[PDB]
Design an enzyme around this catalytic site. Structure first.
Site, PDB file in Angstrom:
ATOM      1  N   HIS A   1       0.812  -1.240   0.000  1.00 10.95           N
ATOM      2  CA  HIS A   1       0.000   0.000   0.000  1.00 10.95           C
ATOM      3  C   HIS A   1       0.844   1.289   0.000  1.00 10.95           C
ATOM      4  O   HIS A   1       0.351   2.360  -0.387  1.00 10.95           O
ATOM      5  CB  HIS A   1      -1.056   0.016   1.127  1.00 10.95           C
ATOM      6  CG  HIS A   1      -0.577   0.588   2.429  1.00 10.95           C
ATOM      7  ND1 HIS A   1      -0.336  -0.194   3.536  1.00 10.95           N
ATOM      8  CD2 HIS A   1      -0.333   1.868   2.812  1.00 10.95           C
ATOM      9  CE1 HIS A   1       0.060   0.573   4.534  1.00 10.95           C
ATOM     10  NE2 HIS A   1       0.069   1.827   4.121  1.00 10.95           N
TER      11      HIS A   1
ATOM     12  N   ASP B   1      -0.712  -7.289   1.997  1.00  8.25           N
ATOM     13  CA  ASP B   1      -0.061  -5.992   2.040  1.00  8.25           C
ATOM     14  C   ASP B   1       1.427  -6.219   2.260  1.00  8.25           C
ATOM     15  O   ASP B   1       1.951  -6.062   3.378  1.00  8.25           O
ATOM     16  CB  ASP B   1      -0.695  -5.107   3.125  1.00  8.25           C
ATOM     17  CG  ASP B   1      -0.325  -3.631   2.976  1.00  8.25           C
ATOM     18  OD1 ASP B   1       0.238  -3.233   1.937  1.00  8.25           O
ATOM     19  OD2 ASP B   1      -0.623  -2.847   3.892  1.00  8.25           O
TER      20      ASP B   1
ATOM     21  N   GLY C   1       2.647   6.583   8.654  1.00  3.10           N
ATOM     22  CA  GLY C   1       4.088   6.695   8.502  1.00  3.10           C
ATOM     23  C   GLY C   1       4.893   5.504   9.015  1.00  3.10           C
ATOM     24  O   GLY C   1       6.028   5.336   8.609  1.00  3.10           O
TER      25      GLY C   1
ATOM     26  N   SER D   1       3.833   2.404   8.443  1.00  2.00           N
ATOM     27  CA  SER D   1       3.502   1.346   7.486  1.00  2.00           C
ATOM     28  C   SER D   1       4.750   0.784   6.843  1.00  2.00           C
ATOM     29  O   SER D   1       5.716   1.518   6.601  1.00  2.00           O
ATOM     30  CB  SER D   1       2.572   1.872   6.391  1.00  2.00           C
ATOM     31  OG  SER D   1       1.303   2.205   6.927  1.00  2.00           O
TER      32      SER D   1
HETATM   33  N1  LIG Z   1      -1.874   0.523  14.303  1.00  2.00           N
HETATM   34  C1  LIG Z   1      -2.775   1.440  14.005  1.00  2.00           C
HETATM   35  N2  LIG Z   1      -3.758   1.712  14.844  1.00  2.00           N
HETATM   36  N3  LIG Z   1      -2.732   2.102  12.858  1.00  2.00           N
HETATM   37  C2  LIG Z   1      -1.833   1.995  11.877  1.00  2.00           C
HETATM   38  O1  LIG Z   1      -0.916   1.192  11.827  1.00  2.00           O
HETATM   39  C3  LIG Z   1      -2.098   2.909  10.730  1.00  2.00           C
HETATM   40  N4  LIG Z   1      -2.998   3.894  10.943  1.00  2.00           N
HETATM   41  C4  LIG Z   1      -3.355   4.770   9.981  1.00  2.00           C
HETATM   42  C5  LIG Z   1      -4.327   5.816  10.427  1.00  2.00           C
HETATM   43  C6  LIG Z   1      -5.448   5.523  11.202  1.00  2.00           C
HETATM   44  N5  LIG Z   1      -6.249   6.523  11.605  1.00  2.00           N
HETATM   45  C7  LIG Z   1      -5.975   7.807  11.304  1.00  2.00           C
HETATM   46  N6  LIG Z   1      -4.886   8.131  10.587  1.00  2.00           N
HETATM   47  C8  LIG Z   1      -4.057   7.164  10.157  1.00  2.00           C
HETATM   48  C9  LIG Z   1      -2.728   4.688   8.733  1.00  2.00           C
HETATM   49  N7  LIG Z   1      -3.048   5.483   7.621  1.00  2.00           N
HETATM   50  C10 LIG Z   1      -4.472   5.463   7.201  1.00  2.00           C
HETATM   51  C11 LIG Z   1      -4.844   6.636   6.284  1.00  2.00           C
HETATM   52  C12 LIG Z   1      -4.268   6.593   4.866  1.00  2.00           C
HETATM   53  C13 LIG Z   1      -3.263   5.478   4.578  1.00  2.00           C
HETATM   54  C14 LIG Z   1      -2.006   5.414   5.469  1.00  2.00           C
HETATM   55  C15 LIG Z   1      -2.027   6.138   6.815  1.00  2.00           C
HETATM   56  N8  LIG Z   1      -1.828   3.688   8.526  1.00  2.00           N
HETATM   57  C16 LIG Z   1      -1.483   2.802   9.496  1.00  2.00           C
HETATM   58  N9  LIG Z   1      -0.570   1.831   9.228  1.00  2.00           N
END
Ligand SMILES: N=C(N)NC(=O)c1nc(-c2cncnc2)c(N2CCCCCC2)nc1N
Length: 245
Positions: free
Chosen positions: A46, A97, A196, A198
């Site tokens: 992703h 993913d 960030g 990810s």
């Molecule tokens: N462990 C967790 N609770 N969350 C995450 O790992 C995670 N969370 C979020 C997120 C969740 N809510 C608000 N903003 C960001 C996210 N996003 C999602 C929005 C667009 C795509 C990439 C950024 N990526 C993640 N990998």
């Protein structure tokens, strides 16, 4: 990383920092990854799906800070960007993913291991720790969901593995979570991965060895009650990893 602690690359020397060129030449952070052999970094599909061109990306190893050079770091172009053919985006939940980046410098070379740059072991097939096991996550992701900035210094924290059964309850994620995903969270929901982080590593001690158990994938919010972090379950993708490397 919500909560946790600041760290440096010596503590997670397989951590890869992945950036993208623009579009005018500005360079911005994309996602984390993990070095699994000298020429291969593993991350999340992703991160790259919207800009799937390998020439746009820069990979650093041995880097402890976001926008400043760390002594001893190595910089690479992406010789090869392999996204998972069965990837799919739900509203939250990404399936398959997982991605591989073959790294190569201007000089045509791979990673030279050092104090700040080491590989991480993959798990043996279908072999994960038991739930409640403490594992560590590392990244340059947001320190708070509401933040606009990413931290300048690398962070890490600890989360506990949650069972398939617990994570699939509707109070948590219902059907969104499959058996190719792992959930992990803090018992107080106090610390977590976020935007960030990810593509970065979930590392657990297995058979007395630090092992890449998961790859940061998704969650609803960050460090929200009943919403664990979700990770690509690395032990269910070894044939894909082996074939494509
Ligand atoms: N462990 C967790 N609770 N969350 C995450 O790992 C995670 N969370 C979020 C997120 C969740 N809510 C608000 N903003 C960001 C996210 N996003 C999602 C929005 C667009 C795509 C990439 C950024 N990526 C993640 N990998």
């Amino acid at each position: 990383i919500i909560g946790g602690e600041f760290t440096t690359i010596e503590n997670q020397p397989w951590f890869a920092a992945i950036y993208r060129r623009h579009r005018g030449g500005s360079v911005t952070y994309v996602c984390g990854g993990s070095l699994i052999s000298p020429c291969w970094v593993i991350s999340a599909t992703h991160c790259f799906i919207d800009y799937p061109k390998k020439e746009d990306y820069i990979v650093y190893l041995g880097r402890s800070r976001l926008n400043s050079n760390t002594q001893g770091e190595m910089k690479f172009e992406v010789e090869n960007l392999i996204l998972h053919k069965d990837y799919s985006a739900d509203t939250l939940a990404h399936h398959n993913d997982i991605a591989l980046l073959k790294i190569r410098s201007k000089e045509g070379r791979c990673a030279q291991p050092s104090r700040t740059i080491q590989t991480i072991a993959l798990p043996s097939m279908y072999n994960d720790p038991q739930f409640g096991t403490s594992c560590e996550i590392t990244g340059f992701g947001k320190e708070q969901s509401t933040d606009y900035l990413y931290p300048e210094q690398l962070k890490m924290t600890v989360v506990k593995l949650i069972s398939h059964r617990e994570c699939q309850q509707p109070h948590y994620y219902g059907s969104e979570v499959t058996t190719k995903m792992l959930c992990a969270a803090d018992p107080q929901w106090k610390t977590d991965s976020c935007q960030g982080d990810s593509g970065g590593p979930l590392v657990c001690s297995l058979q007395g060895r630090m092992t890449l158990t998961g790859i940061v994938s998704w969650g609803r919010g960050c460090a929200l009650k009943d919403k664990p972090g979700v990770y690509t379950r690395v032990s269910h993708f070894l044939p894909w990893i082996r074939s494509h490397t």
